[PDB]
Amino acid sequence: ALLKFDLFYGRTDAQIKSLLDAAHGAMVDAFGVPANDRYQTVSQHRPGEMVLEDTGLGYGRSSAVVLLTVISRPRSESQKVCFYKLLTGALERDCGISPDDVIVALVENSDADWSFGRGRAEFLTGDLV
Amino acid sequence: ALLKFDLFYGRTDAQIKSLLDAAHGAMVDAFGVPANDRYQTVSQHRPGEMVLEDTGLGYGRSSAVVLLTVISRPRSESQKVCFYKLLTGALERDCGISPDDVIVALVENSDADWSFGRGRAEFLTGDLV
Amino acid sequence: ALLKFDLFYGRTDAQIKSLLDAAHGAMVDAFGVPANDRYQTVSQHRPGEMVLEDTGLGYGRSSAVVLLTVISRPRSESQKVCFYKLLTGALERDCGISPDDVIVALVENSDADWSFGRGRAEFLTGDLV
């Protein structure tokens, strides 16, 4: 899977790493992938450059808000549900990020849609299952 | 929905906000979502960092070019058609952006693929419809 | 199609252009699209801001690592397979980028999901095939 993080400027890089590690953990556990299936990016924005509201749900948002986009092979509705709780669990406990400050949007693709190196389609050749 | 904007450096932040507001309006009207279903990001690029041509269609592109990526729950083909015209309508009238300078690519996901806060899947729990 | 590049700071802009051109070539040839169906973005990251491992496959990664996200109308599994080899072929031969340093994730949408200019849905109106 590919986790793309959009966050506001303010964190030190150590804070960024903690965030990335916590989220990695939650992903590995929710989706039962190897600990080294780790593909992550971070873009930092100034206050101009993100607007994130709450669709009337009564969160909660501070400048620590983390927006996460996930590109993923298919997963059961159970796995996703698990992922979100595991994710906010880890971010609160390991990073002190309120669960009010975590937004996730997820996009699915297929086995043919990944090549991890060497122009190889590893899900198709069977180098990965 | 999630609107990700890629644009070239040049705008003041007030110009950025106008753009974001205009596009928000066009989205709310085309898709009939609440005015506070607002999730938006902006990345600014130098001339190196985007190449956007026109597939031989005879637009029109200036450095004001706006590329928009939309992540969305499913929408009818009618709603999308409406969205694009509403979008360029609003950007021309509210921002003075030529409709030649607006590119949109859209990606669909499902109810299970969103969590707006608290590790909750609101479309699944029924906190949102 | 839309090619979004995530790369680490280090390249000159000329190096960036070569990369973008090589990848454009590989895409045009693999997918049989017109040479002017060219839509590309680049984000540069500091060492903090990307973590890209190898899922135990034994690549190979340097700071020249290129992560590519592709948004695309549907393509045959053959076309994609072709694309990845063509892509690493071109990057090694034209840019000197080890095929160990190239990661691709691809996302599909439909004809209704594109508007290249003027709030027009060109695949739907038939301005493009």
Q: What does this entry look like structurally?
A:
It is classed as lyase. Keywords: tautomerase superfamily, beta-alpha-beta, homotrimeric, lyase. It forms a trimeric assembly. Crystal Structures of the Wild-type, Mutant-P1A and Inactivated Malonate Semialdehyde Decarboxylase: A Structural Basis for the Decarboxylase and Hydratase Activities. Three copies of one chain form a homotrimer. With 129 residues, the first copy, chain A, is α/β, with parallel strands linked by helices. The first copy, chain A, has one domain (1-129): 2-Layer Sandwich (Macrophage Migration Inhibitory Factor). Chain A contains three helices and six strands; from the N terminus they run E-H-E-E-E-H-E-E-H. A four-stranded mixed β-sheet of chain A has the order 2-1-4-5, with no helix packed on it. In chain A, strand 1 (2-8), helix 1 and strand 2 form a beta-alpha-beta unit. In chain A, helix 1 packs antiparallel against helix 2. Chain A is globular and about 45 Å long. Chains in contact: A-B, A-C, B-C. At the A-B interface, strand 3, helix 2 and strand 5 of A face helix 1, strand 2 and strand 6 of B. Strand 2 of chain A pairs antiparallel with strand 3 (50-52) of chain C.
